Ligand binder design. Structure first.
Ligand SMILES: N#Cc1cc2c(cn1)[nH]c1ncc(-c3ccc(CN4CCCCC4)cc3)cc12
Length: 264
């Protein structure tokens, strides 16, 4: 079929350090894809990790091409945009939506962790929604292998985004990958339920973080959150990463299993 490899770029979807992401539409089929365009003047690793990924809650990778100094990643277009834009400032979103989004997020992270990949920068700006509002984990530019040949490697690079990063990343030279991703998922949950982030960063020098360690949940954001999801947050946002709830145990949590939401 003539012309089937032609794509028109129609709209910018995001424009950061890497470069930009465009919406592309096929000339013949009108299929939509996102094209991540990165000027090489690291992404090799992003591409490599993207090649390993196949899951309903992870943004699908279709292929890549390099023309001179530009690398072009061809990726799943998520027409719902970012989770970020479903969070009303100071309010959040209805608890049943947040629970469904949280379930999907967990399914995506379980998958990643199971293939030995940590994302390292989970946040609402990176969590995309498809036309059916299914959540998809995007942007593996900071991601890395933490398990290979069934052997764990400890991380040491500080990366991520400060309000979402776990406290051990600021305190310890080395740390386990999985608890850091669990922590960031807890901050995402807080944001969905309160429409605000609890602190600038999880440091002993940050007053809001201290108030949380002192269990002052009569303060915001925590007073906005129902006791059931709040009990889960108490198990996720635990300073000692060895004492922090694991994902198999999040799946046993009372709120995680509470019926809330009707089908579409
Ligand atoms: N990294 C990355 C990445 C980013 C995306 C992707 C695959 N990978 N697939 C995607 N599908 C849709 C959007 C997206 C993000 C935000 C919006 C909303 N708005 C943002 C500002 C510019 C206009 C669109 C719309 C679409 C972003 C992506």
């Amino acid at each position: 079929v003539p012309f089937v490899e032609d794509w028109d770029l129609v709209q910018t979807l995001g424009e950061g350090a890497y470069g930009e992401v465009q919406l592309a539409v096929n000339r013949v089929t009108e299929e939509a894809v996102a094209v991540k365009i990165v000027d090489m003047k690291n992404i090799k690793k992003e591409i490599c990790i993207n090649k390993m990924l196949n899951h309903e809650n992870v943004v699908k990778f279709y292929g890549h091409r390099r023309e001179g100094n530009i690398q072009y990643l061809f990726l799943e277009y998520c027409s719902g945009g970012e989770l970020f834009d479903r969070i009303e400032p100071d309010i959040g979103m209805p608890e049943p939506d947040a629970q469904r989004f949280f379930h999907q997020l967990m399914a995506g992270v379980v998958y990643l962790h199971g293939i030995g990949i940590t994302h390292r920068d989970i946040k609402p700006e990176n969590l995309l929604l498809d036309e059916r509002d299914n959540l998809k984990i995007s942007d593996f530019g900071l991601a890395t292998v933490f398990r290979y040949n069934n052997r764990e490697r400890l991380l040491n690079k500080m990366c991520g985004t400060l309000p979402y990063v776990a406290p051990e990343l600021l305190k310890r030279r080395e740390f386990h990958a999985e608890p850091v991703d669990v922590w960031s998922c807890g901050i995402v949950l807080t944001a969905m339920l309160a429409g605000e982030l609890p602190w600038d960063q999880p440091s002993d020098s940050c007053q809001e973080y201290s108030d949380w360690k002192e269990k002052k949940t009569y303060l915001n954001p925590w007073k906005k959150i129902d006791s059931a999801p709040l009990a889960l947050l108490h198990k996720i946002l635990v300073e000692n990463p060895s004492a922090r709830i694991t994902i198999p145990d999040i799946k046993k949590d009372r709120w995680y299993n509470k019926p809330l939401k009707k089908g579409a």
